[PDB]
Design a protein around this ligand. Sequence first.
Ligand SMILES: *C\C=C(C)/C=C/C=C(C)/C=C/C1=C(C)CCCC1(C)C
Ligand SMILES: CCCCCCCC/C=C\CCCCCCCC(=O)O
Ligand SMILES: CCCCCCCC/C=C\CCCCCCCC(=O)O
Ligand SMILES: [Cl-]
Ligand SMILES: [Cl-]
Length: 264
Amino acid sequence: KNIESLFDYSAGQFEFIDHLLTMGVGVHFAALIFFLVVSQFVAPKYRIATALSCIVMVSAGLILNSQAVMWTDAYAYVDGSYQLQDLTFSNGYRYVNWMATIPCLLLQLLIVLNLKGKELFSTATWLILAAWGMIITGYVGQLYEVDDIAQLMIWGAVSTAFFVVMNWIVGTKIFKNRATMLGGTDSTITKVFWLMMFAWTLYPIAYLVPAFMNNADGVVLRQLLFTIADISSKVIYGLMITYIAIQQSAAAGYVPAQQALGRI
Ligand SMILES: *C\C=C(C)/C=C/C=C(C)/C=C/C1=C(C)CCCC1(C)C
Ligand SMILES: CCCCCCCC/C=C\CCCCCCCC(=O)O
Ligand SMILES: CCCCCCCC/C=C\CCCCCCCC(=O)O
Ligand SMILES: [Cl-]
Ligand SMILES: [Cl-]
């Protein structure tokens, strides 16, 4: 149902996608280890945000590692190309993790914005229905990424709207609660907002590969645009979300965070 099943791959194409996903496993699980160790230097009120990235990291992780195994399961070298065998590959399982990866990030962004209580829970509930929104219409479109490209843009169209709509929430929150933010991180938080519009725009581009490049190199590009969007919303966004909590933790008087920052 997917363009990936349409082609045979040269060995270079196939080894490259495999090294991509594998390098992408190496990284979520090695970011995973950093996010563990620095969690002791984060104040009790921010510490779930570091932890949440421990989850992001295992979750893109598993599916990423899972895509790499299914890649080598699905294809074998026959007569000079890698050809599809008995099992399929697909990015279908990538959109389900998006289901889980985002609320969590959205959650760690909300946590360091210093949202609390009813605004925090409320804004989490809306944010989560919205991207969940964006995510599932994404899902249903790529379903027709071979049979019915009209549903790709049309479902593309729909999921985009949600993406616009949700950025609006996040941005409003971010620029509203800049002034609560301690240690200089009111400057930093606007940067993440920006970074975050890059990694998540890689996605629609990654989602129009069949419309505009329905061949084997588009399959590869699509995965390439997957590893960076991936590394950026999960790993770099993550890295960047960690620094604000430690900074704000030292600003609020958390001596392990002070000591950690002063050590560097
Ligand atoms: C792990 C984190 C993220 C932020 C993955 C995000 C996916 C998107 C921002 C993609 C949205 C869609 C667009 C708007 C285009 C139509 C189909 C998609 C779901 C890929
Ligand atoms: C922030 C960085 C994102 C991660 C970078 C992803 C990995 C960079 C990979 C190398 C790009 C150039 C390789 C060109 C290979 C040609 C593909 C082919 O063999 O057919
Ligand atoms: C089998 C995996 C192959 C790739 C080798 C793994 C090594 C990856 C190296 C760095 C991971 C990228 C993230 C950087 C670590 C973040 C911690 C820090 O801020 O210093
Ligand atoms: Cl605290
Ligand atoms: Cl994912």
